[PDB]
Amino acid sequence: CTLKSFTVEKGIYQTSNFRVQPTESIVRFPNITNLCPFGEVFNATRFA
Amino acid sequence: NGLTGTGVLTESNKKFLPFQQFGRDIADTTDAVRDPQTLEILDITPCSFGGVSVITPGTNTSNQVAVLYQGVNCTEVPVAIHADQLTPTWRVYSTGSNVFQTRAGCLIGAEHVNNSYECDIPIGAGICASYQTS
Amino acid sequence: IQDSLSSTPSALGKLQDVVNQNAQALNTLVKQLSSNFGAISSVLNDIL
Amino acid sequence: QYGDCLGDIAARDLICAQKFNGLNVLPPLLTDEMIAQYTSALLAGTITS
Amino acid sequence: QSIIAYTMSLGAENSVAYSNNSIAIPTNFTISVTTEILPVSMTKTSVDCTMYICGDSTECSNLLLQYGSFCTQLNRALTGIAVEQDKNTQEVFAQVKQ
Ligand SMILES: *[C@@H]1O[C@H](CO)[C@@H](O[C@@H]2O[C@H](CO)[C@@H](O[C@@H]3O[C@H](CO)[C@@H](O)[C@H](O)[C@@H]3O)[C@H](O)[C@H]2NC(C)=O)[C@H](O)[C@H]1NC(C)=O
Ligand SMILES: *[C@@H]1O[C@H](CO)[C@@H](O[C@@H]2O[C@H](CO)[C@@H](O)[C@H](O)[C@H]2NC(C)=O)[C@H](O)[C@H]1NC(C)=O
Ligand SMILES: *[C@@H]1O[C@H](CO)[C@@H](O[C@@H]2O[C@H](CO)[C@@H](O)[C@H](O)[C@H]2NC(C)=O)[C@H](O)[C@H]1NC(C)=O
Numbered sequence A: 001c002t003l004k005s006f007t008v009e010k011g012i013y014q015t016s017n018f019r020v021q022p023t024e025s026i027v028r029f030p031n032i033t034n035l036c037p038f039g040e041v042f043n044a045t046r047f048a
Numbered sequence B: 001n002g003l004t005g006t007g008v009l010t011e012s013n014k015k016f017l018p019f020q021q022f023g024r025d026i027a028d029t030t031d032a033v034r035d036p037q038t039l040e041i042l043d044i045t046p047c048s049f050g051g052v053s054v055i056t057p058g059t060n061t062s063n064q065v066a067v068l069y070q071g072v073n074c075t076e077v078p079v080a081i082h083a084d085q086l087t088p089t090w091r092v093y094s095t096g097s098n099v100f101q102t103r104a105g106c107l108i109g110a111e112h113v114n115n116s117y118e119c120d121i122p123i124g125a126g127i128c129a130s131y132q133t134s
Numbered sequence C: 001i002q003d004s005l006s007s008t009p010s011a012l013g014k015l016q017d018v019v020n021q022n023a024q025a026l027n028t029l030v031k032q033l034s035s036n037f038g039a040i041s042s043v044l045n046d047i048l
Numbered sequence D: 001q002y003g004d005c006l007g008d009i010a011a012r013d014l015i016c017a018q019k020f021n022g023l024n025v026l027p028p029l030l031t032d033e034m035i036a037q038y039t040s041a042l043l044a045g046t047i048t049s
Numbered sequence E: 001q002s003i004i005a006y007t008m009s010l011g012a013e014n015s016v017a018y019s020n021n022s023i024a025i026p027t028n029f030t031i032s033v034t035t036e037i038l039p040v041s042m043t044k045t046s047v048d049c050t051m052y053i054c055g056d057s058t059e060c061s062n063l064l065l066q067y068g069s070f071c072t073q074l075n076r077a078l079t080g081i082a083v084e085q086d087k088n089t090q091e092v093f094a095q096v097k098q
C-alpha cells in the first residue's frame, strides 16, 4: 500500500502508520451546581 | 475542561505548583494535565509507534516477510505496539518465538546462524539478512 | 602529534559541524510544527 | 532507546520529542569495530609488505 | 586588554639572492608528520508522513490520502540518501580484499 504497487523487490522498506485501532472516549469536568441567568437578560422589561 | 487530546494516560510525578494546570513540550504541545475533580497529575503519550521496517526477499520469489521494530526492546513489544488491540495476523509477527535482539532493535521472522556469509539484504549494525534453505 | 590532538580542539572542527548543522536542521523542522500557517490555531484536535 | 523515552529521564530531551513525531535516525551498516579492523589490516599490510 | 582593528599582514617578507653563477645545496634534512581530516559519511534519517502531518487523527488522514504521492516521493529520496551513505563508507574503507 505504501509503495502503491503490486510488486516489491529485495531490500528493507519503511512503512507508514496504517494500522487501525479502536479508541474509547473520556471526559472530566469540575463540580458545578447553579444555573446561568441568561433568561433574566432575555426577560428584561426594558433594554437600554 | 475543553482540552481535547488523544493518547494513553499515566500517573505522573511532576512537581506542579498549586496554581498550575497544564504542561508543555519542547514543541509546545500538551504533555501533562491535572484532573478537574481531584488533584492528581497525568502524563499523556501518543498512540501510533512511528516505526516498523519491513524486510522482503522480493515478491517474485516468496511472500514470506520479516519485521524489524526499531530501537524498542522486545521484552515489551506487545505493550508498545498494542498487539492485543490489532488483527491476529499482526499478532503473529508480534508473538514470534523467532525473536532476535539487535542493536537497531528487535527482528522477528528469521533465525540466527553462527556461520557468516556475505551480505545480501542489508539491515544494519553489522547484521544482514537473506532468503535460503525448506 | 598526540599533543596537537590533545591541545587544539578546533582541529576537529571539520568533523563537528557535519554533526551540529544536521541536528540544527532537524530541530527547526520540529519547531515548524508549532506554526499557525494562517489557521485559527496550530493544534489540530482543537479546531477539529 | 524507546524504553528510556517511556519513563522519566529528562522530560523529552529533544530526542524523544523528535521520535514521537515520526522522525527517526537509522544505524550505519558498519560499527566502529569493523572499521577499526579494516584500519589495522591496512596499517599492518603497509608496514610489512 | 581591548579589541583592536587593523589591516592584516600578508606574511613575512624574505628576499632571495639570485645570481647567474651561484647555486645553493642542502646539507641536512628532517622528517615531518602532518595530519589531515576528511569527513566521509553523514547521519541517516527517515520520516513518516502520516505521523508528522496528521498525527493520530482520522479526518486529517482521510483528507491527506487524496494528496497521495507526495510523502512516497520523500521516502524514495531519503532512502536514496541513506543507501548512498553506506556506499560511501564501503568505497572509502573496504579497499583491501584480504
Ligand atoms: C643534522 O641535524 C641533526 C639534527 O640536529 C644533527 O643531529 C644532532 O646532533 C647534535 C650534535 O651531534 C646532537 O646533540 C647532542 O646530543 C647529545 C645527547 O644525545 C649530547 O650529549 C651532546 O652534547 C649534543 O648536545 C643532537 O642530539 C642530534 N639530534 C638528534 C635528534 O639526535 C646532525 O648532527 C646534523 N648533521 C650534520 C652533518 O650536521
Ligand atoms: C466535588 O469535588 C470534590 C473533590 O474533593 C469531591 O469530593 C471527593 O471526591 C472524591 C473523588 O475521588 C471522593 O472519593 C470523596 O469521597 C469526595 N469527598 C467528599 C467529602 O465529597 C466531590 O465528590 C465532588 N462533588 C460531587 C457531587 O461529586
Ligand atoms: C532489554 O532489557 C533487558 C532488561 O531491562 C536487558 O537485559 C539485560 O541487559 C544488560 C545490558 O546492559 C545485560 O548486561 C544483562 O545481562 C541483561 N539481563 C537479562 C536478564 O537479560 C536487555 O539487554 C535489553 N535489550 C537490549 C538492550 O537490546
Ligand SMILES: *[C@@H]1O[C@H](CO)[C@@H](O)[C@H](O)[C@H]1NC(C)=O
Pocket: A039, A042, A043
Ligand atoms: C422568561 O424566559 C423564559 C424563557 O425560557 C420563559 O419562561 C418566558 O419566555 C419568560 N417569561 C416568563 C414569565 O417565564
Ligand SMILES: *[C@@H]1O[C@H](CO)[C@@H](O)[C@H](O)[C@H]1NC(C)=O
Pocket: B060
Ligand atoms: C518475475 O520476473 C520475471 C522476469 O522475466 C517475469 O517474467 C515474471 O513475470 C516475474 N513474476 C511475476 C509474478 O510477474
Ligand SMILES: *[C@@H]1O[C@H](CO)[C@@H](O)[C@H](O)[C@H]1NC(C)=O
Pocket: B112, B113, B114, B115
Ligand atoms: C552458536 O554457537 C553456540 C556456542 O555453543 C551454540 O550454543 C549455538 O547453538 C550456535 N548457534 C548456531 C546457529 O550454530
